[PDB]
Design a binder for this molecule. Structure first.
Ligand SMILES: Nc1ncnc2c1ncn2[C@@H]1O[C@H](COP(=O)(O)OP(=O)(O)OP(=O)(O)O)[C@@H](O)[C@H]1O
Ligand SMILES: [Mg+2]
Ligand SMILES: [Zn+2]
Lengths: 76, 191, 50, 287, 286, 70, 73, 48, 252
């Protein structure tokens, strides 16, 4: 199924996944399209923080719903 | 899903204070608001349900929010005392829906009137043609007691869904204190 | 006046103590408690003036 | 490629949010977002700035939960008009401006989605009143550092105008990032209304000044001005003497008359000429 | 109750940018927002603000809206991101004191007890200070209504800060009147404030437009001060107000006469300091 | 313009500031100080300091890295 | 991955020191977010004061790989 | 050049000592056995 | 649980040690002036949250390494020689075990136990109770034993001193302990100082034979001044013991 990954950068990323897929597989697919490891990524679905240990169906994420992508932030 | 925003206008007028309806007039319309805000949320998760009034003091009692914990808190000892002022009820309904986060939603308002109104029919028809230029569809549902065969409200709905509107209705009140869960089964089933 | 903003970042100069000079244009100078240094002279300083 | 004439336009509005958030938590490295409006491959415009709750250490500073980020941007779209994150900043406390080994790392995270995330340093200590030292940066590939190939293909006479500090040159400049020349977007929309709003008064001058004590203060200076002139009745008398370049190095322990003796003359003038003139207008105006 | 208010130039500026962001409506909008600050030592402080969504329709202009969820969460973020910061009241863009600002203050006083408002300027032309603030006082009193409530202006000025003084003095870089000597007072308040008294003489000339033709409420509590001003008009020139005026001119000018006498001798000692460097080098150098 | 550059020079008067002590001066606008790290230095000065507030045995501020008079 | 990263930053030159004192410091009042720091004063266990054998004293809020129970002045 | 206080079991982990500065925990190089690094013996040590 | 420890170890390795300093005075609201325990004096700033009014001249603070600004204030130190001099005695001997010299036991009780519990009687007569007293005699009569009777009574503010650990070969470290023992004594107001075998540090004086007894007479004259020089020596009682009091300084 298709999903929307709407970043904070005005940009919407489309991915083809399955409802039993883990979030770490979704962040792996973003790594295939962008080159960013899943530690540097945070996924937000309707104000909720997503965990890699559960699947899309545990958070009731379905076809073509909107995610939020915020990146990891550590300065020094 | 479909883009709307359901906006309820509760009735805290002073004619709704007795006990002719069985638990309370207040609590019976409250659970009617409780089940439709479960009907709009579960059919579309984007709709928030907040309440406004059309009394003498048109207050934002609860904010337009998707939570009902403020709605459930204020509707107890809500003090339904006040003179009805429906002539500004159009303005406090319409200007609220222009404060929404989306204008691409369908402007859908329900209105609960359970008191005798003292509006001018010449003033609301200027407000109805105002809503013709504002493209607003409102299903007005009558509760309580009123001037029976509701005066100025048949003439307002007709001047609401005019000019190819043809989709709004006027759910009138039966003058019998029965259970009001079956009275509002016609808006929850279809439009 | 506005040169000194780009002049004072130059590091300071040490101060030492001449003992005696020798052959081939060098002097023997000791620092505060730091060891004696065999250093050369600049061109604007005479050895017999030292 | 790029032309090293990048010319980042910022604002008049964002930099006060930069320094106030930068200085209220100054010795820790505070940071935030840059919410702006992209233009062409050459220039970029950053109009709005907001920070986040952070968690830090001495040498490192992190962020916390990302739900703050998306909810903040939703509220700024619905109020005003929507924008897009053009970059990010941080604040070296009293250092200067460079990318440290951890500052470079979260930049590397942000340059992936858009390749033009501007990295900005603000120092709210080095900035006294004038220079505000800012010096926005952006990474260069260390892969081309391995190639020995010099990037960025200079095609305009605009880049090599400001010279870098040696202390920023000790750090990664110029082996992993570069500098950008910037200026400020100024307009009568704002420039007229911070000038003609800040330093203004209403009665400070149509009023008199402690009328029994102003004339008393006209002796509180003149009394020691006698003996200060006695030093001026002293120091000229030791001239036609030892070569007054010597009279510069020698007189650094004590105060000279000559400079101090024209110091009070300005004070004993403007205290009097103002107070005499302002009194003689109220005779005309007030009846 | 409140001594005075202290406004930073940031919140002064943090309304103008929002006035630009809603400037595309064209027709009519007042900027109304939440004012944040921390009043201490009986002195009102103003630090930060934003603006809340707000609209207004002209027919029956008693219908306002404050999206309080936007007020709840964004202040909750601001209480998070600065716990020193809190609410101090509100503001509006204030051209001409619109009518809804009698109960906007009463709508949101359940947060701030002394919910102060601030009237700002978007088109600056004056000779005063173009920031105005009122306060809420109510009265069951003299003549008007059983329920009466009128706003009263507490004095206003723009406070500075060591952080932001770096910023604004870098952001000016424009025509300035620094080097305060004998001349800055002449132009900050002798050229200027005398014309500042114009628009206050002319302001009470504007209330005077009702002699037989203007608005129907007439005086009752406006003329007790105007009766006093011609009563407290100052003393005439007959007494030793003549004589003691010549007395102090005969004292203040003596100090100027001494100080100018010094000015001639000092530059004369400087004159020989150039005649020592003129004649003693033409034979030496050539 | 001179008054704008007059105040600009004090950006060197920032916060990581170390303490020496005045000893003497060779000439105009160049002096000899002794830091509290034991070693003495021959330093340049900053021009805006009134020179006539120096040498009983004066406490002075010194720059951190370049170590000049501040 | 942790035991690798600990092995990298457990590298053996060791400036040996002496434990002067082992604190009990309380959380501060008042702390705020935006410039929040989990490093200074959020817990009470444990801070300590050391003295290196280069005659240098240091404060530390975080002890490190060794806990606080088996340490003593 | 330095002076060694003691070794310890299971591991090299030598305790070293220098003239006025601190005491360190050090290791060998490849060019020497751990045999003739007995305790209380002066040894030469790189600066980094 | 083994993973949970290995994640705090990741959280450990971002912390940076902080320079321990000391506050000298306060120039302006942000200009502070401190001196490290390393060396030189520094001019420094602070945080805008950390109570710039409470930095009195005298207190002990923490600094940053990189930017060198004050991050935090701290209390006083307790110099772990004296902490390991304070309360490391598990001795439980008692007055029933000593026997034969009960006249002196009541005599010694009078300076250390009586006015600490009932001071109002001396204030009525008008005299001050004694500061301290010493115990001299032939070896092995119960001098060290009698202090061990008192030592099983206090346990937290009783300070036994061997009078030979207090000397070391550095410059001023021998006299730093005597300062920082009695600074610990005023902080714990009911307290007893015990000083066994003072003949090591006591001495008489000399005409300065060796270089060693230069810096011992400095260590001795710090003790003499801290007893009765410009300080109300209150609630701090001193007990001293020796085998031979021939070799004592008459100023002591
Ligand atoms: N009066 C006494 N009653 C019982 N036992 C005693 C008495 N005096 C001494 N002893 C025994 O003698 C031992 C030595 O005691 P202590 O160290 O106090 O002697 P001292 O007077 O301090 O001699 P020195 O000053 O030479 O050490 C103790 O262990 C104790 O058992
Ligand atoms: Mg003994
Ligand atoms: Zn940084």
């Amino acid at each position: 199924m298709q999903i929307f990954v709407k970043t904070l950068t005005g940009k919407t990323i489309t991915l083809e996944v399955e409802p039993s897929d883990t979030i770490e597989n979704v962040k792996a697919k973003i790594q295939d399209k962008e080159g960013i490891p899943p530690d540097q990524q945070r996924l937000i679905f309707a104000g909720k923080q997503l965990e890699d240990g559960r699947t899309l169906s545990d958070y009731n994420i379905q076809r073509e719903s909107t995610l939020h992508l915020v990146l990891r932030l550590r300065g020094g | 899903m479909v883009l709307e925003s359901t906006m309820v206008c509760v009735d805290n007028s002073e004619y709704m204070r007795n006990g002719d309806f069985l638990p309370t007039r207040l609590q019976a319309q409250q659970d009617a608001v409780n089940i439709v805000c479960h009907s709009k949320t579960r059919s579309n998760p984007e709709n928030n349900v907040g309440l406004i009034t059309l009394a003498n003091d048109c207050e934002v009692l609860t904010t337009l929010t998707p939570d009902t914990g403020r709605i459930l808190s204020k509707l107890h000892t809500v003090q339904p005392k006040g003179k009805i002022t429906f002539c500004t009820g159009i303005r406090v309904a319409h200007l609220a829906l222009k404060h929404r986060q989306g204008k691409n939603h369908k402007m859908r308002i329900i209105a609960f009137v359970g008191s005798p109104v003292e509006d001018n029919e010449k003033d609301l028809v200027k407000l109805a043609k105002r809503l013709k230029k504002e493209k607003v569809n409102v299903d007005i549902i009558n509760f309580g007691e009123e001037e029976v065969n509701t005066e100025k409200l048949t003439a307002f709905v007709n001047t609401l869904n005019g000019k190819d509107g043809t989709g709004s209705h006027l759910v009138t009140v039966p003058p019998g204190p029965s259970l009001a869960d079956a009275l509002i089964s016609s808006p929850i089933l279809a439009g | 006046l506005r040169e000194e903003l780009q002049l004072l970042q130059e590091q300071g100069s040490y101060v030492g103590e001449v003992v005696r000079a020798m052959d081939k244009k060098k002097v023997l100078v000791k620092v505060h408690p730091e060891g004696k240094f065999v250093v050369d002279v600049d061109k604007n300083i005479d050895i017999n003036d030292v | 490629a790029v032309d090293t004439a990048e010319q980042v336009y910022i604002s008049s509005l964002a930099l006060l949010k930069m320094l106030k958030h930068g200085r209220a938590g100054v010795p820790m490295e505070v940071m935030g977002l840059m919410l702006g409006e992209f233009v062409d491959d050459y220039t970029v415009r950053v109009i709005d700035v907001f920070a986040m709750p952070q968690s830090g250490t001495g040498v490192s500073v992190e962020a916390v939960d990302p739900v703050f980020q998306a909810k903040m941007l939703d509220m700024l779209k619905q109020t005003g008009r929507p924008e897009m994150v053009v970059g990010w900043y941080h604040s070296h406390p009293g250092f200067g401006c460079w990318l440290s080994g951890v500052d470079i790392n979260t930049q590397q995270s942000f340059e992936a989605l858009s390749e033009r995330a501007v990295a900005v340093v603000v120092d709210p200590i080095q900035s006294v009143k004038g220079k505000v030292v800012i010096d926005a940066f952006r990474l260069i590939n260390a892969n081309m550092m391995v190639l020995g190939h010099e990037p960025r293909q200079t095609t305009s006479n605009l880049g090599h105008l400001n010279k870098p500090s040696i202390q920023a040159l000790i750090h990664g400049l110029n082996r992993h990032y570069y500098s950008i020349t910037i200026n400020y977007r100024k307009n009568e929309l704002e420039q007229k209304m911070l000038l003609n709003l800040h330093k203004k008064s209403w009665m400070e001058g149509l009023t008199l000044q402690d009328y029994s004590e102003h004339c008393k203060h006209n002796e509180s200076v003149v009394k020691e001005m006698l003996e200060l002139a006695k030093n001026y009745n002293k120091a000229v008398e030791e001239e036609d003497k030892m070569t007054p370049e010597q009279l510069a190095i020698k007189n650094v322990g004590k105060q000279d008359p000559k400079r101090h003796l024209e110091e009070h003359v300005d004070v004993l003038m403007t205290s009097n000429i103002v107070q005499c003139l302002a009194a003689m207008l109220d005779t005309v105006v007030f009846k | 109750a409140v001594q005075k208010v202290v406004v930073h130039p940031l919140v002064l500026l943090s309304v103008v940018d929002h006035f630009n962001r809603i400037g595309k409506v064209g027709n009519q909008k007042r900027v109304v927002g939440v004012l944040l600050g921390s009043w201490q030592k009986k002195v009102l402080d103003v630090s930060n603000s934003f603006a809340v969504p707000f609209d207004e329709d002209d027919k029956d202009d008693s219908v306002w809206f404050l999206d309080h969820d936007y007020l709840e969460n964004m202040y909750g973020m601001f209480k998070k991101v600065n716990a020193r910061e809190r609410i101090v009241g509100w503001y509006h863009t204030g051209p001409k004191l619109h009518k809804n600002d009698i109960a906007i203050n009463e709508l949101m006083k359940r947060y701030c007890p002394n919910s102060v408002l601030v009237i700002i300027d978007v088109k600056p032309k004056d000779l005063g200070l173009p920031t105005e603030a009122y306060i809420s006082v109510e009265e069951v009193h003299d003549d008007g209504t059983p329920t009466s409530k009128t706003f009263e202006h507490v004095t206003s000025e723009i406070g500075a800060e060591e952080a932001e003084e770096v910023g604004v003095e870098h952001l000016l870089r424009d025509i300035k009147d620094t080097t305060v000597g004998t001349l800055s007072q002449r132009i900050t308040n002798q050229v200027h404030g005398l014309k500042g008294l114009n628009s206050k003489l002319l302001d009470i000339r504007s209330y005077l437009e009702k002699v037989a033709t203007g608005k129907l409420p007439i005086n009752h509590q406006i003329i007790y001060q105007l009766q006093d001003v011609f009563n407290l008009l100052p003393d005439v020139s007959l007494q030793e107000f003549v004589k003691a005026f010549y007395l102090k001119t005969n004292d203040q000018m003596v100090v100027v006469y001494l100080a100018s006498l010094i000015r001639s001798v000092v530059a004369l000692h400087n004159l020989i300091n150039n005649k020592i460097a003129n004649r003693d080098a033409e034979k030496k150098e050539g | 313009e001179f008054l704008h550059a007059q105040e600009e020079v004090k950006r060197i008067q920032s916060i990581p500031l170390v303490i020496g002590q005045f000893l003497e001066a060779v000439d105009q606008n160049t002096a000899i100080v002794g830091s509290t790290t034991g070693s003495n230095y021959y330093v340049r000065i900053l021009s805006t300091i009134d020179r006539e507030l120096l040498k009983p045995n004066a406490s002075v501020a010194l720059h951190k890295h370049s170590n000049a008079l501040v | 991955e942790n035991s690798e990263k600990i092995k990298v930053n457990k590298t053996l030159p060791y400036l040996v020191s002496n434990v002067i004192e082992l604190l009990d410091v309380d959380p501060n009042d008042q702390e705020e977010d935006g410039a929040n720091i989990d490093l200074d004063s959020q817990r009470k266990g444990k801070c300590a004061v050391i003295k290196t054998s280069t005659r240098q004293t240091y404060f530390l809020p975080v002890i490190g790989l060794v806990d606080a129970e088996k340490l003593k002045p | 050049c330095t002076k060694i206080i003691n070794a310890d079991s299971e591991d090299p982990k030598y305790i070293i000592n220098v003239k006025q500065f601190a005491k360190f925990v050090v290791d060998l190089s490849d060019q020497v056995a751990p045999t003739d690094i007995e305790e209380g013996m002066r040894v030469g040590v790189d600066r980094n | 649980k083994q993973y949970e420890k290995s994640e705090n170890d990741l959280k450990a390795l971002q912390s940076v040690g902080q320079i321990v300093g000391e506050v000298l005075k306060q120039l302006t609201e942000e200009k502070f002036i401190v001196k490290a325990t390393n060396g030189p004096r520094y001019v420094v700033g602070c945080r805008r949250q950390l109570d710039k009014s409470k930095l009195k001249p005298g207190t002990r603070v923490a600094l940053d390494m990189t930017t060198l600004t004050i991050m935090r204030y701290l209390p006083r130190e307790v110099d772990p020689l004296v902490y390991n001099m304070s309360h490391e005695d598990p001795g439980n001997v008692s007055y029933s075990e000593i026997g034969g010299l009960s006249e002196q036991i009541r005599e010694l009780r009078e300076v250390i136990e009586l006015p600490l519990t009932n001071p109002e009687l001396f204030q009525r007569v008008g005299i001050i109770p004694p500061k301290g007293c010493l115990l001299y005699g032939p070896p092995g009569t119960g001098k060290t034993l009698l202090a061990r009777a008192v030592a099983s009574q206090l346990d937290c503010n009783f300070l036994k001193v061997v009078s030979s650990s207090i000397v070391d070969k550095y410059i001023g470290e021998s006299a730093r302990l005597i300062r920082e023992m009695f600074n610990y004594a005023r902080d714990h107001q009911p307290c007893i100082i015990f000083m066994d075998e003072i003949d090591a540090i006591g001495g008489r004086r000399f005409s300065e034979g060796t270089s060693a007894d230069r810096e011992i007479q400095r260590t001795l004259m710090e003790l003499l001044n801290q007893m009765d020089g410009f300080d109300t020596l209150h609630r701090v009682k001193m007990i001293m013991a020796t085998n031979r009091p021939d070799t004592l300084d008459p100023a002591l």
